Amino acid sequence: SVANLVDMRDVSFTRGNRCIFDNISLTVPRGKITAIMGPSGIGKTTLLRLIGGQIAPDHGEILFDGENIPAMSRSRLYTVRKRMSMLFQSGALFTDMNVFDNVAYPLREHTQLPAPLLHSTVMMKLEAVGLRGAAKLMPSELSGGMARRAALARAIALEPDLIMFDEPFVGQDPITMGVLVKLISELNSALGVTCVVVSHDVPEVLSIADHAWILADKKIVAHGSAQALQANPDPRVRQFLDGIADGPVPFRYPAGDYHADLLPG
Amino acid sequence: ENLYFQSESLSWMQTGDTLALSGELDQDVLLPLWEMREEAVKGITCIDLSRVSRVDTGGLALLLHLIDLAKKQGNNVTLQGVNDKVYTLAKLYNLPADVLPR
């Protein structure tokens, strides 16, 4: 078996005349939750599209379960994509179908399972998102939060090995925000789904993540636990997390080597 | 009476009052158990999942339908050997008490 479901090694990406990523390397450990954070417009969505093989990197290797995606043939890529699901914010629901049929579409297209069971499954997945009573409603009849939540419910319908969420918590009240955080956590726990979460709702995503990566100035500036980041003195990391420049380090007393604390000698 | 079905990824066995499952309760492999649901739940008071390694949402829906069809016959059904991840999945979907024994 392979420890990192996604393994980016020395990846660079340039769009037109402007550089987006400069020789970055990160890992998405299998069965865990990885958060990817950073200032707006730095191309985190582009990073997710890179992992999904939708875009190709200029240089470097993107290993999915060991296989270099940019080096894969098209048929091989098509079959490997079946283990992935991506929720984009630009993506929209089918306007001609209601909420229920929108969430049922992936299941009817790839699940090939009995209609009573499919019905129960779509009802459960609507309950996980708080839209069960809105099954009949059309997308035009939906508010922003409801529509985003419906897109999310469709994104988790097939429960593949890897799910990538692009800002799953935006446009929601804080209680619904917590409900969605719980959704990602319990999905990962019960099914072993490897989750990559892109979010500027930093406390929320850090409350569930196993690993976190911060991106700035076309590179990776930090990674580690929430405790590690709270004790990181780097001005860019502090500027992003605290929102203010030249503020204090919240965890003022940094910690020593953890392996040495646990296993002295 | 004693029923036995085995496949590569899913097997089940009805001994007397207990239906015991083995393998993966996944959307691709669960179909045979759906097809013989009424036979599998006939005069059973217990479902044993001790030997089940994985249950996805489709498998959980199958499980709920089995519990429902079993009780319709007049049999309240107990659950045994349930992996904690199954109850986490039930928690995710807020399953009521009358649908799944805790």
Numbering used by the authors:
A (entry chain A): 4 to 268
B (entry chain B): -4 to 97
The study reports:
MlaB is stably associated with the cytoplasmic part of the transporter complex: one MlaB subunit binds to the side of each of the two MlaF ATPase domains. Here we report structures of the MlaFB complex, and present a model for how these two proteins may work together.
In contrast, the MlaF1B1 structure represents an inactive ‘half-transporter’, but will be discussed where it provides additional insights into unique features of the MlaF-MlaB interaction. Moreover, in the MlaF1B1 structure, which crystallized in a different space group (P212121) from that of MlaF2B2 (P3221) with completely different crystal packing, the MlaF CTE is ordered and the terminal helix is bound to neighboring MlaFB monomers in a similar conformation. Indeed, when our MlaF1B1 and MlaF2B2 structures are superimposed on the catalytic subdomain, we observe a rotation of the helical subdomain by ~10 degrees. Perhaps as a consequence of this subdomain rotation, the Q-loop is displaced from its usual location near the site of catalysis, consistent with its role in linking the site of ATP hydrolysis in the catalytic subdomain to the helical subdomain.
